[PDB]
Write a protein that binds this ligand. Structure first.
Ligand SMILES: CC(C)C[C@H](N)C(=O)NO
Ligand SMILES: [Ca+2]
Ligand SMILES: [Ca+2]
Ligand SMILES: [Ca+2]
Ligand SMILES: [Ca+2]
Ligand SMILES: [Zn+2]
Length: 316
């Protein structure tokens, strides 16, 4: 829409208040003009038809409960774009400031969120397994990161290249969560998952086994569901990513941790410079070691800890 940029206030899914960038043209629109070519939030109105309608509000106040998911989808897209741009110097997920579009209230009691190749979609949950998914910033950055992969390595969604795809998104969704200082952890979806249980989460990076995910290559899942287990085998790469950053002894293998700043940067480089659409876990390791070596040198500690962590997980 063409209009004047302004700022509005709303309450998020968790009941937290915030300011969001909007646009004024008779109605106040969930259109942010300050980031790239902008961020657009739509109302899917409980249908499956996308994107649906650009969100329109009459007073610039988004305190209704129906408003909660649009607020968070919109804002959280905004800090993710910021993290990318400030930390890896990337403009938007394509590297060129493309517009970010998000649709909220998709279907009825849809327990999930996704990147469909051109926009982000968020269900509202059944209200028991999940609450509106845009409420989790790690969910929101996990999804945007899928855009980012699609435009860089392009990892096909299945088997090992697809588990690497899902672990990238979970690694940067977690870096984004730490980036915002929004109560960070090494957990996924904890904030929107099972409103009645406490302390649980979708997946764990620190201990993928908590919830049954392999934490070792020898545990790798070989069937067929979940596209050859894209969301299962991703735990092997999450565990490795977790050890490099924090350090630890996994299966008798000791890793000195180099911290998260450096984990973000050796991964963003592997992802943008050496990963290909068909890369497998042995190729990710070569790529991570090669990036670590590019940045810190051949004989660095950083180079040594990425080797150690892939060795602890049994990758190669
Ligand atoms: C993990 C969910 C919260 C979202 C879906 N599971 C996914 O990988 N989207 O990318
Ligand atoms: Ca209003
Ligand atoms: Ca958290
Ligand atoms: Ca988390
Ligand atoms: Ca819970
Ligand atoms: Zn995903």
């Amino acid at each position: 829409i063409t209009g004047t940029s302004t700022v509005g206030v709303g309450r998020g899914v968790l009941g937290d208040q915030k300011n969001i960038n909007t646009t004024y043209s008779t109605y106040y629109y969930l259109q942010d003009n300050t980031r790239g070519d902008g961020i657009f939030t739509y109302d899917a109105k409980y249908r499956t038809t996308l994107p649906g309608s650009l969100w329109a509000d009459a007073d610039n106040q988004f305190f209704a409960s129906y408003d909660a998911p649009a607020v968070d989808a919109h804002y959280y897209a905004g800090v993710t774009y910021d993290y990318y741009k400030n930390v890896h110097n990337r403009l938007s997920y394509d590297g060129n400031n493309a517009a970010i579009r998000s649709s909220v209230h998709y279907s009825q009691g849809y327990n999930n969120a996704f990147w469909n190749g051109s926009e982000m979609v968020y269900g509202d949950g059944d209200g028991q397994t999940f609450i509106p998914l845009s409420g989790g910033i790690d969910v929101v950055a996990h999804e945007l990161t899928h855009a980012v992969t699609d435009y860089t390595a392009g990892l096909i969604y299945q088997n090992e290249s697809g588990a690497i795809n899902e672990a990238i998104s979970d690694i940067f969704g977690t870096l984004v969560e730490f980036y915002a200082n929004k109560n960070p952890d090494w957990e996924i979806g904890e904030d929107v998952y099972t409103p009645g249980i406490s302390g649980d989460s979708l997946r764990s990076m620190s201990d993928p086994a908590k919830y049954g995910d392999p934490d070792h290559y020898s545990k790798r899942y070989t069937g067929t569901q979940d596209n050859g287990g894209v969301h299962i085998n991703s735990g092997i790469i999450n565990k490795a990513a977790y050890l490099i950053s924090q350090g630890g002894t996994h299966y008798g293998v000791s890793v000195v941790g180099i911290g998260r700043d450096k984990l973000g940067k050796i991964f963003y480089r592997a992802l943008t410079q050496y990963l290909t659409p068909t890369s497998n876990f042995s190729q990710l390791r070569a790529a991570a070691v090669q990036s670590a070596t590019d940045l810190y040198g051949s004989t660095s500690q950083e180079v040594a800890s990425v080797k150690q962590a892939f060795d602890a997980v049994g990758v190669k």
